[PDB]
Amino acid sequence: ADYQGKNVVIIGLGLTGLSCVDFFLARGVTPRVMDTRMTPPGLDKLPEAVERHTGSLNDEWLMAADLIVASPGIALAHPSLSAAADAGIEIVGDIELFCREAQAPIVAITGSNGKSTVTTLVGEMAKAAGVNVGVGGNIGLPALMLLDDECELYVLELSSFQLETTSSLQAVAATILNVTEDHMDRYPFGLQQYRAAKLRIYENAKVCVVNADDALTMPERCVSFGVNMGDYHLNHETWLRVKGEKVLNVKEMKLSGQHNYTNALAALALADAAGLPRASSLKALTTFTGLPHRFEVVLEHNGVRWINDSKATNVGSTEAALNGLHVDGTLHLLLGGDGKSADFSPLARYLNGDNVRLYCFGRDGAQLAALRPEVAEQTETMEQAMRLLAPRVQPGDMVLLSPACASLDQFKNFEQRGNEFARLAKELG
Numbered sequence: 001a002d003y004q005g006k007n008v009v010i011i012g013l014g015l016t017g018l019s020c021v022d023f024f025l026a027r028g029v030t031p032r033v034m035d036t037r038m039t040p041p042g043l044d045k046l047p048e049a050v051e052r053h054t055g056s057l058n059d060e061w062l063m064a065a066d067l068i069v070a071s072p073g074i075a076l077a078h079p080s081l082s083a084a085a086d087a088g089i090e091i092v093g094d095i096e097l098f099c100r101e102a103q104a105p106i107v108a109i110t111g112s113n114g115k116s117t118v119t120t121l122v123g124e125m126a127k128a129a130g131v132n133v134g135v136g137g138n139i140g141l142p143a144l145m146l147l148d149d150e151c152e153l154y155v156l157e158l159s160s161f162q163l164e165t166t167s168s169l170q171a172v173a174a175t176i177l178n179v180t181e182d183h184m185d186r187y188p189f190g191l192q193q194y195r196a197a198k199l200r201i202y203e204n205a206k207v208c209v210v211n212a213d214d215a216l217t218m219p220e221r222c223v224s225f226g227v228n229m230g231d232y233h234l235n236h237e238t239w240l241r242v243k244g245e246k247v248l249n250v251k252e253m254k255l256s257g258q259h260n261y262t263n264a265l266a267a268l269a270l271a272d273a274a275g276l277p278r279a280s281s282l283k284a285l286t287t288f289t290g291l292p293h294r295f296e297v298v299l300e301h302n303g304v305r306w307i308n309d310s311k312a313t314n315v316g317s318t319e320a321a322l323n324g325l326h327v328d329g330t331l332h333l334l335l336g337g338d339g340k341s342a343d344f345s346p347l348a349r350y351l352n353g354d355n356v357r358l359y360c361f362g363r364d365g366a367q368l369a370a371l372r373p374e375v376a377e378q379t380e381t382m383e384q385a386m387r388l389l390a391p392r393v394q395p396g397d398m399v400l401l402s403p404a405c406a407s408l409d410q411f412k413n414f415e416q417r418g419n420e421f422a423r424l425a426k427e428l429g
């Protein structure tokens with residue numbers, strides 16, 4: 001693509017905005033940057049030469065722009081951005097800039113839950129094949145930083161937000177893993193508007209990998225995975241099966257849980273479509289131990305398991321933690337943070353009985369305590385909740401951080417809440 005002499009404006013001074021600043025500067029284009037916060041995270045890391053505006057969006061700069069590059073954390077529906085769009089000014093995100101440059105096939109992964117797990121699995125399958133693979137996107141490594149002429153395959157975790165501003169993706173294999181309510185504070189037209197953002201991933205995809213059990217993942221390019229049905233499915237010992245044959249006894253996997261078995265099926269379907277050898281892909285499934293903060297046991301001490309599921313940021317992932325969960329004693333369940341306008345009431349059916357205690361914190365703590373107020377306590381912070389529950393923990397109990405919310409209302413970055421839980425569990429357990 002050619003950006004020479006164009007007036008380029010970047011919105012957002014986080015990971016994405018800084019990677020876009022570096023991208024343009026390395027092409028001889030000096031962008032201008034703005035952020036609605038007065039001191040965004042990347043402000044200190046911004047080159048001196050780059051003009052910046054903070055504390056609001058600058059409409060003079062936006063309406064003067066040839067190209068607006070919007071970070072995923074700002075809505076296209078922001079009035080300033082809709083005014084620019086109405087004026088015919090091109091708006092893209094970093095994933096769009098990436099696609100225009102990439103010189104290797106892209107595997108693209110979205111869905112309400114499981115994206116990082118499936119992204120990492122496909123990455124491990126490529127490494128087991130000896131393929132030079134770049135893994136990035138919403139997983140936390142900005143896609144523009146992957147670009148490398150040696151790279152032979154790209155695997156991108158894509159959020160619904162990133163997909164909204166992307167128009168040139170032509171994935172070799174793309175998936176929507178599942179669609180359940182999330183990000184409703186950014187989708188005023190409801191679940192179908194949220195779904196429509198994710199459906200963009202299939203546009204011009206060579207193969208579409210859909211969830212046989214979730215009709216909202218449907219867009220002949222379509223290969224399905226599922227539990228009892230699908231081209232890739234399970235048979236219960238549980239086996240992964242592909243189109244009529246056993247490929248793996250899940251006793252060989254380090255992951256467990258049905259949703260992780262179907263994560264493995266989706267990852268295998270994407271890897272197969274990307275042309276990776278079946279045998280090394282299956283080997284990767286058996287070596288992968290799971291990402292930190294995704295239902296991760298961080299401490300087993302004195303008869304008590306402390307489980308860090310900090311990456312459960314919506315009702316669907318917390319349901320997956322709770323459904324069929326075995327606890328010998330009491331479950332001490334930590335919930336709270338930024339609930340993104342979610343309806344939490346689907347969690348209520350898991351919270352009956354004499355063996356569960358809720359410790360709710362953060363912005364939407366009261367809304368979560370209302371699920372079953374008689375067994376709930378509310379604090380301001382997670383650390384307060386942890387120090388409250390720690391005296392009550394008995395041998396046989398489980399302490400689960402599975403908050404059903406984003407962390408941004410109280411935590412500085414996207415790893416901090418999980419890191420803090422780990423540190424406090426070690427201190428307190």
Ligand SMILES: CC(=O)N[C@H]1[C@@H](OP(=O)(O)OP(=O)(O)OC[C@H]2O[C@@H](n3ccc(=O)[nH]c3=O)[C@H](O)[C@@H]2O)O[C@H](CO)[C@@H](O)[C@@H]1O[C@H](C)C(=O)N[C@@H](C)C(=O)O
Nearest residue numbers: 012014015016035036071072073137138139140142159414
């Ligand atoms: C909110 C979001 O989409 N975050 C993704 C983003 O990180 P980055 O630091 O660039 O974020 P950002 O776009 O600057 O937005 C972060 C926050 O800054 C704030 N923000 C942003 C710009 C601005 O002008 N004003 C403002 O207040 C918003 O509160 C926003 O929530 O780009 C990174 C690299 O691609 C991603 O790893 C990261 O995913 C995280 C882990 C995440 O929470 N993503 C959400 C979407 C999710 O998984 O549900």
Ligand SMILES: Nc1ncnc2c1ncn2[C@@H]1O[C@H](COP(=O)(O)OP(=O)(O)O)[C@@H](O)[C@H]1O
Nearest residue numbers: 112113114115116117259294295311312317320
């Ligand atoms: N397919 C799935 N369905 C429901 N929950 C899932 C699924 N895969 C993983 N989880 C849970 O989703 C939450 C985040 O997992 P992650 O792999 O990081 O997905 P994402 O990148 O989409 O947020 C964690 O609580 C994890 O246990």
Ligand SMILES: [Mg+2]
Nearest residue numbers: 112159182183
């Ligand atoms: Mg999300």
Ligand SMILES: [Mg+2]
Nearest residue numbers: 115116138139
């Ligand atoms: Mg993720």
